[PDB]
Structures are given as structure tokens and as C-alpha cells.
């Protein structure tokens, strides 16, 4: 539930950012956080959740 | 046969030059078959989407 | 029916045909009760021998060792390596509770 809340908060912060400034790609370090990210903001699919194995 | 390889590559690009999506191409074909176009609200939504896409492509 | 067992293939250079008969029955896919009992007795003896041999060197019986009977076993299946074996074995009366469950 905490992870889902974090993903929802990330999606809401993306929505707070303008659509013209929406990140076209969303690199997530957490492996399992991509599916909740896509589920939370499926209404805004302009962002591609690309994997970044090498964690910065 | 004269003997050659066909240099054929056809597509469905709108009169504005934008390559219509296969869903959009099917929508255009169905509109042509039905002989009916988009409505007022559909026109407004299309204009807003096109303006937003153009603004995004600008920068 | 061998008449309608032939598939097709939409090749890029034309049309290509494909070739392929009784639907199997469970009369033989399940071991008979007497054979199952004999195999279970043999597997129980083999598993006991392997466990004793491992205990001789004071080592656990690995899942790789004595894995020939990975499916067949003493109670018709060698589940001695299954999780919670010690937990389930403490609770007896499985057969009666399963049979009496028809009225519950």
C-alpha cells in the first residue's frame, strides 16, 4: 500500500506538471515500480516507463 | 514481363501531410464511406490536440 | 480423423500445405494400483536406504540425491522434501477427517 501510494504521488506530481512539460520518458530505478506507475497514470500514456538498470 | 523489382510503397497520409494512424486511417475511411465528417465537439477536440502536439514539437 | 489433421501455411511465395491417429485415453497413463503399491514399497525401501547412507556421513538427503523417484513415492508420491513436513506429520487422523468431511 505504501508503494502504491508513492506511485500515486509520483503520478499526481507529474499531473501537476504541465502536459507541455510532461516527461516523455520515466526512468525508474525500482524494478517493480514500473507496473504501479503505468496503472496509476494509464490516463496519461505519453510517458514511456523505460528501464535504467545502472542505478544512479 | 519487362523485368524489374517493384518500387512500390503506398500509405495513407492526410492532405495536411501527417501520416494518419491505422486507427485514424480506418476512421477516415469509415467517414468517407458513411459520407459524414466530424462534429463540432470532435472538431474542437481535434484542434486542441493538434495545437498541443504542435506546441510540444516546437520545443 | 486423419482426414482433417492437416494444417496450412501462409508462405510469402504462395500457399504451402502441411502434414500430420487416436486421441489417448487414461487407461494406461495412470499406473495400476498393484504396480503403484509395488513401486511405492520399493521407493520407500530405497529412500530409507539413502537417508541412512546420508546419516552415515552425517549429511542431509539432498533433493538431487535419490531423485529418480521424484514423482513416484511411498505414499504414491515422494513428498518428504515438501515444506512443513514436520508440521503436517504431527497432526494425524487425515483419512477419517477427509471421509467424515462429507457430512460437514
Amino acid at each position: 500500500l505504501a508503494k502504491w501510494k508513492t506511485a500515486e504521488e509520483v503520478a499526481a506530481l507529474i499531473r501537476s506538471l504541465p502536459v507541455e512539460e510532461q516527461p516523455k520518458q520515466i526512468i525508474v530505478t525500482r524494478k517493480g515500480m514500473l507496473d504501479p506507475l503505468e496503472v496509476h497514470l494509464l490516463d496519461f500514456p505519453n510517458i514511456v516507463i523505460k528501464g535504467s538498470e545502472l542505478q544512479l | 514481363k519487362d523485368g524489374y523489382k517493384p518500387d512500390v510503397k503506398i500509405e495513407y497520409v492526410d492532405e495536411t501531410g501527417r501520416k494518419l494512424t491505422p486507427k485514424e486511417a480506418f476512421r477516415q475511411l469509415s467517414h468517407r464511406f458513411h459520407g459524414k465528417g466530424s462534429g463540432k465537439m470532435k472538431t474542437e477536440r481535434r484542434m486542441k490536440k493538434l495545437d498541443e502536439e504542435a506546441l510540444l514539437k516546437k520545443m | 480423423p486423419q482426414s482433417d489433421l492437416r494444417w496450412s501455411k501462409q508462405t510469402d511465395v504462395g500457399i504451402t500445405h502441411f502434414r500430420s491417429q487416436l486421441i489417448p485415453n487414461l487407461y494406461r497413463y495412470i499406473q495400476p494400483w498393484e504396480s503403484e503399491f509395488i513401486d511405492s514399497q520399493r521407493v520407500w525401501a530405497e529412500y530409507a536406504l539413502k537417508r541412512q547412507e546420508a546419516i552415515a556421513q552425517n549429511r542431509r538427503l539432498t533433493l538431487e540425491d535419490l531423485e529418480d523417484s521424484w514423482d513416484r513415492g511411498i505414499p504414491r508420491i515422494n513428498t518428504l522434501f515438501q515444506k512443513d513436513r514436520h508440521t503436517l506429520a504431527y497432526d494425524k487422523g487425515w483419512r477419517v477427517r477427509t471421509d467424515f468431511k462429507q457430512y460437514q
Binding site: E53, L54, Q55, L56 | - | -
Partner: protein
């Protein structure tokens, strides 16, 4: 920590901008700080791997810095 202290503000008179967070530096200062940081990172990689410190290719070094499991 101490290596990061040397890398960020090598000179006590040099610090981050009042409106900024990360320590501001010019091209030469950034180059010196990055050289020191690369030396420290090579030392850390050698300590973690028990191998030669500077024995990784430029692409390999970039992947190691990025976090690839090399």
C-alpha cells in the same frame, strides 16, 4: 565523507552559491575536483574488488560509475 569534502570544496574560500546547493566551480576547478573524485572512486572499486584500482576501460569505468554490476 572526507573525500567528498575535498571534492566539493577543495578551498575553504570556495563554496556553493547562496541561491544554489551543489558547489559551484569553473572548468579548471571542476576538472581538478573530478580528477580527485575519480581517483577516490578507483580506490573504492579496488578495495571492494581486491583488484587493480585503475584497470577498467573508459566504457567500463562509465558503466561502473553508472551502477552496472561489472
Amino acid at each position: 565523507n572526507d573525500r567528498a569534502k575535498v571534492i566539493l570544496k577543495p578551498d575553504k574560500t570556495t563554496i556553493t552559491e547562496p541561491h544554489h546547493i551543489w558547489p559551484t566551480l569553473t572548468d579548471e576547478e571542476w576538472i581538478k575536483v573530478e580528477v580527485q573524485l575519480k581517483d577516490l572512486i578507483l580506490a573504492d572499486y579496488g578495495k571492494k574488488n581486491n583488484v587493480n584500482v585503475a584497470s577498467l576501460t573508459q566504457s567500463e569505468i562509465r558503466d561502473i560509475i553508472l551502477g552496472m554490476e561489472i
